Amino acid sequence: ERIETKILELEAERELLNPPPSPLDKKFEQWEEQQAVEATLAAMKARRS
Amino acid sequence: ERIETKILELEAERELLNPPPSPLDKKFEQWEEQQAVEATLAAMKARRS
Amino acid sequence: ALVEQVRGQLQKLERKYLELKSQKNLYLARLKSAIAAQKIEEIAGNLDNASASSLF
Amino acid sequence: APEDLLERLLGEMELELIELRRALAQTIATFKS
Amino acid sequence: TERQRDAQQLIAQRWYEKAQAALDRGNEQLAREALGQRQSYQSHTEALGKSLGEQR
Structure with missing residues (x-):
């Protein structure tokens, strides 16, 4: 017990x-x-769709 | 008790x-x-709305 | 009846002990904290820039 | 020299910014328990 | 003192930029908290700013 505490x-x-x-x-x-994923990926999902 | 007081x-x-x-x-x-938040934010809510 | 009743006393009393020991830690901790907070505010009072025989 | 106290007095205060640092540790430790 | 002031405004600039991220796109409310948080840092900048001018 004293070990745990x-x-x-x-x-x-x-x-x-x-x-x-x-x-x-x-x-x-x-x-x-x-958006750091979606905004980059929103660019990607627009750039690379 | 005397500890508490x-x-x-x-x-x-x-x-x-x-x-x-x-x-x-x-x-x-x-x-x-x-207003230190609203006035700055009133500028922001006008500047950046 | 005698053996069962006396065991109840021990069971009741044992629980009450560890409960007391838990509170001892808290009260001591608050005390050691409270004494410490005072003297910073006192040593600051020595150096507080209050025109009360402040060193600064 | 009054100018010398300014250093020593501040030296004393370095003891509690660690001592009071222990007090919070004990209080949080009891809370976790 | 000059170096300390520069660091404080950089954090405010980061929080400024962070609010410049928040208030866009319709979430002015999170900008309120960020600006509300930013106000604590703004106060520090003002106090140090005048001291630097005075110390010059």
């Missing part, structure tokens, strides 16, 4: 050391990549 | 050391930011 603290301490992405950034890196 | 005094003593914002200031930092 010892692992929990190592991972959690790393998170504050290197914060995970904010949801706001998460929304665009998918939202923009959709 | 001991925590109460530490936080409260810090508050007088560093006062929290007055409501008057609170009103504008939201009220101005609305």
